[PDB]
Amino acid sequence: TYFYGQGEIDAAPIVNGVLGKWRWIQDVSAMSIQLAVEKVEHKESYSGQKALVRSFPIGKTATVNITLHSIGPDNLALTLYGKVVAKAAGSVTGEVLPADLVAGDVIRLANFGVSELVITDSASSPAPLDPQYYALRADGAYGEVQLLGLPTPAPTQPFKAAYEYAATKQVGMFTAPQPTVALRYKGINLAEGGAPVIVELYKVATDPLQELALISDGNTVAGMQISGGILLDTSKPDTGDLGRFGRIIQLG
Amino acid sequence: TYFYGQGEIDAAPIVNGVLGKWRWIQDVSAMSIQLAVEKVEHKESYSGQKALVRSFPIGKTATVNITLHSIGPDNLALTLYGKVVAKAAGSVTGEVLPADLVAGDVIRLANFGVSELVITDSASSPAPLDPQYYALRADGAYGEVQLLGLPTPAPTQPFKAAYEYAATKQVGMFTAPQPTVALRYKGINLAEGGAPVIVELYKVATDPLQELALISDGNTVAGMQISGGILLDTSKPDTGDLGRFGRIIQLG
Amino acid sequence: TYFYGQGEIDAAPIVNGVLGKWRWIQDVSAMSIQLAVEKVEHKESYSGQKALVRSFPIGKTATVNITLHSIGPDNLALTLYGKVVAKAAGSVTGEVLPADLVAGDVIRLANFGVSELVITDSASSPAPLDPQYYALRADGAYGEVQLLGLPTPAPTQPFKAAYEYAATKQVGMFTAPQPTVALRYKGINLAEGGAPVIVELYKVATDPLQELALISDGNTVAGMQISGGILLDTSKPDTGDLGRFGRIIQLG
Amino acid sequence: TYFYGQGEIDAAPIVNGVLGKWRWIQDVSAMSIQLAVEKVEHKESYSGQKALVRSFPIGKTATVNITLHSIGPDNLALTLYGKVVAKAAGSVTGEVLPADLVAGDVIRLANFGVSELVITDSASSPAPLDPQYYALRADGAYGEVQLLGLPTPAPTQPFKAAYEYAATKQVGMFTAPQPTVALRYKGINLAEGGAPVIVELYKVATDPLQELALISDGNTVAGMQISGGILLDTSKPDTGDLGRFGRIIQLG
Amino acid sequence: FLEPLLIERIRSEVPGLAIVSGVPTLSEQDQPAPSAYVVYLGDETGTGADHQGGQRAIQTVGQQWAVVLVVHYADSSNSGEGARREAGPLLGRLVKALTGWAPAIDVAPLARSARQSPATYASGYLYFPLVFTARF
Amino acid sequence: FLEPLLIERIRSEVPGLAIVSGVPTLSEQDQPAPSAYVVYLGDETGTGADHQGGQRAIQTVGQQWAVVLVVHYADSSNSGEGARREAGPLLGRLVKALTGWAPAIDVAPLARSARQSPATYASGYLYFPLVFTARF
Amino acid sequence: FLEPLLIERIRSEVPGLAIVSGVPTLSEQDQPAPSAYVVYLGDETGTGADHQGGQRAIQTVGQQWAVVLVVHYADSSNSGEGARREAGPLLGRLVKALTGWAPAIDVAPLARSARQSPATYASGYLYFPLVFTARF
Amino acid sequence: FLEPLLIERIRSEVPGLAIVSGVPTLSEQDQPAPSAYVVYLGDETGTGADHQGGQRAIQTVGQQWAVVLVVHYADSSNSGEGARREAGPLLGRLVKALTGWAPAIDVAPLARSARQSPATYASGYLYFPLVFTARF
Amino acid sequence: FLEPLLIERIRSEVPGLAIVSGVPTLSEQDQPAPSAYVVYLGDETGTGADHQGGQRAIQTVGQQWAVVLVVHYADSSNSGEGARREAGPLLGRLVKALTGWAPAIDVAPLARSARQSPATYASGYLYFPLVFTARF
Amino acid sequence: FLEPLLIERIRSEVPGLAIVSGVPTLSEQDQPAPSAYVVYLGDETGTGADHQGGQRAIQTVGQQWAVVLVVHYADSSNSGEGARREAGPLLGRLVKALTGWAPAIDVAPLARSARQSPATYASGYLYFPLVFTARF
């Protein structure tokens, strides 16, 4: 009869009212549910106390806050209103680098994970440049190339860079509509020897992430906090005891 | 699937919509991104609960906060709405010092980094004053000269100072229009063995620095906090999965 | 490229637009500069996001806060809207003390730093009172005299006090108009081996001191905090890169 | 040129504009002076910055806060808007105590400091009651008498109490008009070897005490905080450098 | 900074058998006489109030001061009869002389506590953790 | 400042074999008898409430007081049968006499805790970190 | 960082009989002469005010410094007559020389406390917990 | 994490007579030579500012570092003449070499304090509680 | 205040060679057998919540309890093969018996931690700083 | 609670001459070989964030772990040439093996710090106060 819960959360997106495929939202550090009710009050005046005598509720709302520490692209799509874009690995053959380059310039490439970088000189007789005259910062992860030097007989300035780029996953900002996801919290209550508890929320509309600290200070893992409103599902039976907002199952 | 990021930030100014040259913003201590959304809600009233049943977003905005500890002139131009002015080293030959000078007066010179200071006396026969009668406070860095004494036969009061001044870089206050800079955050996630992460923000409009403590107390390096709004870029494709606000690339 | 500044501040009052004589403001513990900007925003509505698309600034203001620990009269004139009054040392010969004096009464004199106090008795034959019948509290610094006793043959009550008073400096409350002072902060940046930095503010209008604790508790020196607005100087060239609010000079 | 002040405060009440007799306000723990100014601002619009260009003050006010730990009647009159009432010691002969008294009743007397208490029995033959049948709580300081017992032949119930009461000083609540007091702060600045400083405030209108904890917890002496506004004195010369609000004298 | 003038009479060589004992854990088994047995607990400090003044950054410093009772007469593991019953007058004497009997004091309250000073026993003979204030 | 009047009967020489032991780490191997074995933990203090009064800056001071159980009878590394099962009545007796049995008290609550006093074992024979309140 | 220039005269070998004593608990029974007997208490630190500057992250550091009085002349368990009565002038001399007598100081207040320095006795001969500020 | 490259020249075997002394209380009576006598005070830490970064939860850690001066030449209980007057240039040399002389540093400020480092004497010969910052 | 009833079976004389060892630094070189080697870390306390009740000012007191693993079998500076691989089942047995196996409990949660209990090695043989909760 | 599986290879008997030294102040004068010389600093704890979960009241506990470098080869009071210059690769090896080389980890970040780990010297031979994070 005491609660200290630890467990997992499964989310299923709702598209045009058809149930989606459940997925694990990965690690979650905090889950909170808050209930709000509006009440209209009636006061009697026969006792001289002008005090409250009755009240009936008019409003009913529920909010859910979730703190997730996973920065996976699947979660980014759900939290950033984005849609995942997958780019397959490939090669570049005739990319043209900026002109008027001199020692000290930093060239930014269009793709990441560059490898086997080659820069052919522009001339009737192609002459690849010596690798010792350029360096790859951040082991080519950021696609940045630094010029270390140039031969005394200055070669033709425009260059032709060819290389290989690895596959990547990208998420756009505000590129998807407001997601609607059904939530299933499967938890273990340690206070009762690890008893099972299940919480079902049929329809939830989420709110974008509020803050995202890209450069963190301290020993705390970056956290992503999402707020959402539990909407009223109109498909479930009205008279059923399961309600229309959410339910809790405890085995006993 | 966990984030603790450390990395660099590259900024490219936007002038009349043409991309500028990327530069490193130097050391940065904190970066935060916040998302704000406005929603209009619809409530049904057939169940008697007068509760929320639907919501659709109307507003979409994103803000970015950056804390940089570099006081370089290039960053001062970006944060103070200023434009850098470079003054080359030179010489002065006939500067006139204030009249009615007596022992104890402090003379302020128009240029900094004074060296080889000479003060010729005003007379038909020029007679440079003895160096022992004047001193240079703050080794001439601030261009301040203190009078130590005067000969008993008081020389002609008006003076003619000649010296050498070094080159300098200056930044004006509110002397440039609102900068618009594209931002590239290249970070390493230590939680995954140092995995690469890239964050692209296409268009950002910055807000002047809020506070700048010139005289600091404690053991904390002076910090410069800048806020900015991520504007909507109208040049990128509308249907593209990269969106129009920003994107995140994670190699995997 | 890091800042931890310690330095001096020189102030020059502005009277009718003519530059005054620079003076050192003595010890200063904290200096802060804050920038405020007002922006008008334009939002597009073709993407359905009703989000921000443009912004232009309309307002521009700058504020400066300075914490000075010097209670010198020159600084009091600047911070209290006062003007210094110098009183030269002198003598008093025929001051009349209050009547109906008895043992235990405390007489307050019009001047401070009293010395060689003499109280001649009122009678046809002057008879200076014995010094043992009166005492000087706070070694006459506050100009307070205590009666220790009176002879049994009560002398004539009205007295004639003569003494010497030292010179003093006084500052009135709200006795001067709103000062306008140009500020020069000459600082040393310890993070770069003590590099020189100069900050110039052409026109500043100050705000009276907010609090002044005359009786202090603890081990903290009394602090005087002054706020001011950096006004727009209309004399400097408009197109010049030095601006019209302020500038920063860094030697490099 | 540094301030850490400790000193005394002398107050002189102002009645119909005639100076009163200065008195020491006893121990004081904190004194603060705050200045408030209202400013009307003018903004130019020829540079496109719509920024501040001028400001002139319209309002001028000064407030003073004093924390005094003395609960003397003289200070109570000043802080509580009261006037001191002195009651001389005397005797009571025919005070009538309440009827229907029984063991355990507590009788409250009209005067404090009761001594030599006598209670004569009501009868044709006066018979003072035995002292062992009554007790004096709080050694008669509060004027409370407790009945310890009564003789089996119950004496006549109404009693006639006679005793002696000591002199006292009383202060009423809101029984005096708003005091106006001139203040003289004579302080020693320890930071300069104990230099003398004097602060003169010509006219101050005080505000009642805000809180007074009669039963205190901890090791802190009860404090009485008073706020006041420094009014503008119209008697002093307008052009004089001493102003009309207040002045500071520093010997040097 | 004037207490000694009255401390001189505050202290009056309470024990008649204990000599050069340097009194201020207890033995409770071989003590020659029931000395005062004063103890020290701590201090009280605070600022931002009437205690703090102007110069010298000083304030009315709260001071702690306590005593230990050593009688072990009529109370030798038998019962607490005569240990504190006889001490009562002695406790009042100690608390009135050592505390509350101050010279001409202006900013030296010399607080005294007649009541509200609980004491608990232990070690099987006698313990008395007295709690009194000094304020100076 | 009146507890001794009842402490006198609170303490009644619990051990019959232990003599002059000065009871208030344990041996658990050569103890002559199961003495009370009282222990001290700390104190509780607070102000700014009904505890604090006016003068003397005193308040209702929270006081901590605990005991250690030493029986090692029927529990000699065999099982916890007879260690606390027999103590139960003894624990009640101790907690009712040593605590909760106070004289005429006005500002001396003398709080007592019959339940909610957990104890954990260690060292292989017996440990009992009792947690009780005294408030005086 | 200039105090030694005046410390040189601040210290003047107060004791005539004590030699190489390394003065800065006391014996109170075999001390050859009444030396200064300086003691150290602690330090005061703070930022976010006029104390803190710009570079070097330094501030006007509050410094604590106290002394112990050892006379035991005319006060040998007899009465506090001659212990502090004679010290008064000596206390003023000590507090004026060792403190408040500073060189040309700009950010070195060298705070001095003539009054408001209470001292309490103990150990049966003499104790003096002086409280003075140094600020540097 | 690169200081050794310049520490190598920072340290240059200041004492000519002291050998294998393991220098970093002082004797002040039998020290062979006036060694550097470096001391350690503490550390400075903070987050939520430009010091903290992203991954690795590291920040620009404030570091404390101080020195002790041992000359006792021309100052042997006579006067503070030659103790710090000669040290002045030596103090500048020490504070400029041991601190403020850093390698190519990006996030290693290596803060140095030329002034605002007060020092107080005690023990009758010489004390110097130097206060300097290291920041790395 | 009822744990002993199950502690009796919780403890079952784990080591067969260690006798009267009084187990709850380790030797790691001459230990006769791999005993349980329980350790104590601290306590958890809190109020102003459902833990606190009415009278007796008691609350659900958080309790800390940890263990040390001593096997040194198949792990004698060779490799961590057999040290914790064999312990896994033993760790589960220990954590299920010593913790999580509680009597009829109403306000005695007896929290147990099967996972999330990291342990780091040192001293060259074996260290295991276990982190478990007791809550009672 | 799975680190040993990789700790087994993390530790590989770095010193060839030191035998049964129980390595995790240093001598710096008679050490047989340059062992790893690991040290422990403290711990990091926090709640009310993604670290804390539901049941078992556990969170991602921050863990501290540091090392000491002992080479004294080519650096014997001569200069810091060969002390850390040779260590650089060794420091990388140590920081990559002992830290950052973790098993399949879900809530065990095993944070590693390649840079931003300053170290200061003292004692005249070598000191290295390494600062690294463990998080588990």
8 Å CB contact between B107 and B96: no
Q: Looking at beta carbons, which residues of chain B come within 8 Å of H49?
A: 29-30, 67, 220-221, 223
Q: Which run of H or E residues covers position E57?
A: none
Rounded Cα–Cα distance for residues B209 and E72 (Å): 75
Instruction: Give the type of residue at G65.
Output: W
E24: nearest CB among G116, G124, G131: G124
User: Exposed (0-12), middle (13-18) or buried (19+): which is E54, by Cβ within 10 Å?
Assistant: buried
Residues of G in contact with H116 (CB under 8 A): 1, 53, 56, 58, 107
Say which DSSP state I89 is in: H
In chain I the beta strands, taken as DSSP E runs, fall at 38-39, 43-44, 62-67, 132-133
Question: Which structure tokens are listed for C139?
Answer: 């070694």
Smallest Cα distance from D42 to chain C, Å: 10
Look at residues A244, H122, J74 and name the one whose alpha carbon lies nearest to residue G24.
Answer: H122
Which of the other chains make 3 or more beta carbon contacts under 8 angstroms with chain I?
A: A, F, J
Mutate to test the interface with E, among G112, G121, G123 (most CBs of E within 10 A): G121
Strand ranges, E, within H56-113:
62-67
Report d(CA F7, CA E124) in Å as an integer. Answer: 11
Q: How many Cβ contacts (< 8 angstroms) between chains E and F?
A: 63
Are the beta carbons of C251 and B112 separated by less than 8 Å?
yes
Distance, in Å, from the CA atom of D92 to the CA atom of I38, rounded to the nearest integer, reads 80
- Using CA atoms, how far apart are residues G41 and J47, in angstroms rounded to an integer? 38
Chains I and H: 3 or more CB pairs within 8 Å of each other: no
E-strand ranges in E14-130 read 38-39, 43-44, 62-67
Residues H127 and H112 sit within 8 Å (Cβ to Cβ): no
Residue H76 tokens read as 């042997």
Measured distance CA(I59)–CA(F133) in Å, rounded: 12
Could you tell me if D227 and D65 are in contact, meaning their C-beta atoms sit under 8 angstroms apart? Answer: yes
Phi, psi of C107 (to 5 degrees): -100, 130
- Residues B58, B211: contact at Cβ < 8 Å? no
Name the residue among H44, H52, H107 with its Cβ closest to that of B30.
Answer: H52
Tokens 């209380």 -> residue:
H25
Residue B76 to residue C35: CA distance in whole angstroms: 13
CA-to-CA distance for B119 and A24, rounded, in angstroms?
81
Buried-exposed string C206-229: b where 16+ CB fall within 10 A, e elsewhere:
bbbbeebbbbbbebbbbbbbbbbb
Q: How far is CA D187 from CA B239, C209, G1, in A?
A: 77, 20, 29
Output the DSSP codes for J50-103: TT--SGGG----EEEEEE-----SS-SSS-SSSSSTTHHHHHHHHHHHTSS--S
Please state, in angstroms and as integers, the Cα–Cα distance from residue B220 to each residue in C35, G53, H44, following that order.
22, 12, 9
Kindly determine whether residue A231 and residue B33, on different chains, have CB atoms separated by under 8 Å: no
**3-class DSSP state of D24:** strand
> What SS3 state is found at D96?
strand
B202 near B245, Cβ under 8 Å? yes
Chain B residue numbers touching A234 (CB-CB < 8 A)? 44, 53
Which among D30, D187, D220 is the nearest to E46, CB-wise? Answer: D220
Give me the amino acid identity at C86: A
Nearest by Cα to C178 from C211, C204, C212: C204
Among all residues of chain H, which has the CA nearest to that of G20? H124
Q: Residue D28's closest chain E neighbor by CA?
A: E50
Q: What is the DSSP string of A110-154?
A: SSSS-EEEEEEE-SSS--BPPGGGEEEEGGGSS-EEEE----SS-
Method: cryo-EM
How far is E68 from chain C, CA to nearest CA, in Å? 34
Is I24 within 8 Å of F84 when comparing Cβ atoms?
Answer: no
CB-count exposure of residue F27 (10 Å: 0-12, 13-18, 19+): exposed
DSSP state for residue B128 in the 8-state scheme:
B
- D163 close to D115: Cβ distance less than 8 angstroms: yes
Main-chain dihedrals φ then ψ at residue D133, nearest 5 degrees: -90, 0
Return the residue matching tokens 């890209």: A214
Six token digits for residue A201: 């929320």
Q: HSE-up of F52 (CA within 13 Å, CB side)?
A: 15
Q: What are phi and psi of E16, to 5 degrees?
A: -95, -20
Distances (CA, A) of B170 to B89, C78, C200, C247: 14, 29, 10, 7
Please say whether the beta carbons of J51 and I118 come within 8 A: no
Give me the phi and psi of E48, to 5 degrees please: 65, 40
User: How many C-beta neighbours within 10 Å does residue A237 have?
Assistant: 9
- Considering CB atoms only, which of C49, C54, C185 is closest to B60? C49
Give the Å distances, CA to CA, from D27 to C161, D6, D22, E50.
31, 11, 15, 8
Count of alpha carbons within 13 angstroms of residue G79, beta-carbon side: 6
Q: Among partner residues C215, C219, C220, which is closest to E53 by beta-carbon distance?
A: C215
Residue with tokens 């916890």: F80
3-state DSSP assignment of residue G131: coil
Chain G residues with CB-CB distance to B214 below 8 A: 54
Question: Are B92 and B119 in contact, with CB atoms under 8 Å apart?
Answer: no
Residue A183: beta bridge partners? A11, A201
CB contact set of B14 (below 8 Å; sequence gap of 6+)? B20, B179, B180, B181, B182, B203
Residue G86 has phi, psi (to 5 degrees) of -75, -25
Q: How, if at all, do strands D18-19 and D5-15 pair?
A: antiparallel
C-beta atoms of E113 and F58 within 8 A? yes
Would you call J20 helix, strand, or coil by DSSP? coil
Among C161, C205, C162, smallest CA distance to C11 is for C205
Residue E44 contacts residue E63 (beta carbons within 8 Å): yes
8 Å CB contact between C106 and C138: no
State which residue of chain H sits closest to C5, comparing Cα positions: H111
How many Cα neighbours within 13 Å face the side chain of A218? 14
Pairing of strands C180-189, D18-19: unpaired
Which residue in chain H has the smallest CA separation from G61?
Answer: H118
Chain H residues close to J113, C-beta within 8 Å: 56, 58
Measure the CA–CA gap between D185 and D193, rounded to whole angstroms. Answer: 18
- Nearest neighbour of B6 by CB, restricted to H44, H53, H135: H53
- Across the interface, whether the CB atoms of I115 and J1 are under 8 A apart is answered yes
Instruction: Identify the bridge partners of residue D185 per DSSP, sorted by sequence position.
Output: D9, D199
Pick from B199, B245, B252: which is nearest to A214 by CB? Answer: B199
Q: Which two tokens stand for residue B184?
A: 């590239």
What 3-state class would DSSP assign to H63? strand
A215 contact residues in H (CB cutoff 8 A)? 52-54
Angle ∠(E16,E21,E23) on CA atoms, nearest 5: 100
User: Element (H or E) spanning C151, and its range?
Assistant: none
Q: Do chains G and F touch (3 or more CB pairs under 8 A)?
A: no
Which residues lie closer than 8 Å to D35 by C-beta, 6 or more apart? C80, C174, C208, C209, C210, D61, D62
| Chain F residues contacting E via beta carbons under 8 Å | 1, 3-5, 7-9, 11, 13, 20-24, 38, 40, 53, 56-58, 61, 63, 65, 107-108, 134, 136
Task: Give dist(CA B144, CA B136) in Å, integer.
Answer: 6
d(CA J109, CA B2): 8
Residue F112 β-bridge partners: none
- Residues A185 and A104 sit within 8 Å (Cβ to Cβ): no
- H59: nearest CB among A214, A217, A220: A217
D194/C contact by beta carbon, under 8 A: no
Compute how many other C-beta atoms are within 10 angstroms of the C-beta atom of residue J86.
15
**Scanning every residue of chain J, which has its alpha carbon at the shortest distance from the alpha carbon of B191?**
J109
Which run of H or of E encompasses A39? Answer: strand A28-43
CB contacts < 8 A (B, H): 57
Return the closest-CA partner of residue C66 out of C147, C137, C8.
C8
Contacts of C227 (CB under 8 A, 6+ apart): C63, C64, C65, C206, C207, C210
J-chain residues near I124 (CB < 8 A):
11, 20-24
**CB-CB neighbors (< 8 A) of A2 in chain I:** 109
Cβ-contact B232, B201 below 8 angstroms: no
Contact E4, G81 (CB under 8 A): no
3-state secondary structure F32-88: CCCCCCEECCCEECCCCCCCCCCHHHCCCCEEEEEECCCCCCCCCCCCCCCCCCCHH
Q: Which residues of G touch B217 (CB under 8 A)?
A: 47-49, 51-53, 57, 59
- H runs (alpha helix) in chain C: 73-79
Nearest to I23 by CA among I64, I63, I70: I70
CA-nearest residue to I99 within chain A is A193
Which of H81, H40, H35 lies closest to H64, judged by CA?
Answer: H40
How far is the C-alpha of A107 from the C-alpha of A144, rounded, in Å? 6
Q: What is the DSSP letter of D194?
A: S
* D25 phi and psi angles, rounded to 5 deg: -85, 10
> For residue F10, what are the β-bridge partners?
none
Return the number of other C-beta atoms located less than 10 Å from residue F34's C-beta.
19
Q: Which of J100, J109, J112 is opposite residue B2, by nearest beta carbon? A: J109
Among candidates A88, A85, A111, A112, which has minimal Cα distance to A170? A85
Distances (CA, A) of B2 to A185, A222, A223, B195, J56: 21, 7, 9, 10, 22
Answer yes or no: are the C-beta atoms of B175 and B77 closer than 8 Å.
Answer: no
Nearest chain H alpha carbon to G106 = H116
Instruction: Tell me how far apart the alpha carbons of residues A184 and C238 are, in angstroms, rounded to a whole number.
Output: 65
Tokens representing residue A205 in the block: 């509309």
Q: Per CB distance under 8 Å, which residues of H are interface residues toward A?
A: 47-49, 51-55, 57, 59
The whole-angstrom distance between residue I85's C-alpha and the CA centroid of its chain comes to: 18
Beta bridge partners of A42: A54
Measured distance CA(D200)–CA(D183) in Å, rounded: 6
With an 8 Å Cβ cutoff, are G112 and D4 in contact? no
Q: Which of H102-107's residues contact partners 24+ apart within 8 Å by CB, and which partners?
A: H102/H3, H102/H6, H102/H136, H103/H2, H103/H3, H103/H5, H103/H6, H104/H2, H105/H2, H105/H136, H106/B27, H107/B27, H107/H60, H107/J116
Q: What values do phi and psi take at G34, rounded to 5?
A: -80, 85
Contact indicator for A201, A115 with CB cutoff of 8 Å? no
Instruction: Kindly tell me the burial class for residue A64, based on how many C-beta atoms sit within 10 Å of its own C-beta (0-12, 13-18, 19 or more).
Output: buried
- Specify the resolution in Å: 8.0
Q: Phi, psi (5° rounding) for residue D99?
A: -80, -170
Least Cα distance to J3 among H123, C88, I80 occurs for: I80
> In which element (H, E) is residue C54 found?
strand C52-68
Q: Which H/E stretch holds residue G38? A: strand G38-39
Residue type, J88: G
Say how far apart CA B178 and CA B80 lie, in whole Å.
10
**Cβ contacts from A onto J, under 8 A:** 56
Are the C-beta atoms of residues B5 and B197 closer than 8 Å to each other?
Answer: yes
Are the C-beta atoms of C66 and C226 separated by less than 8 Å? yes
Report phi then psi at B139, rounded to 5: 35, 40
DSSP state of A232: P
Three-class DSSP category at D86:
strand
- Distance (Å) from the C-alpha of residue D182 to the closest C-alpha of chain E? 20
What gap in Å lies between CA F55 and CA A19, rounded to an integer? 72
In this complex, whether B and H touch, counting 3 or more CB pairs under 8 angstroms, is yes
**Measured between alpha carbons, how far is E108 from D70 in angstroms, rounded to an integer?**
13
Q: Beta strand A195-207 with A159-165: parallel, antiparallel or unpaired?
A: unpaired
Which among C95, C94, C89 is positioned nearest to C113, based on CA atoms? C89
- CB-CB contact of E26 with E33 (8 Å): no
Question: How many Å apart are CA I63 and CA I46, to the nearest integer?
Answer: 11
Q: What is the distance, to the nearest Å, from the Cα of residue E113 to the centroid of all Cα atoms in its chain?
A: 10
Mode of pairing for the β-strands spanning D5-15 and D90-96: unpaired
Rg value, chain B, Cα = 29
Please, are residues E100 and E6 in contact by the beta-carbon 8 Å criterion?
A: no
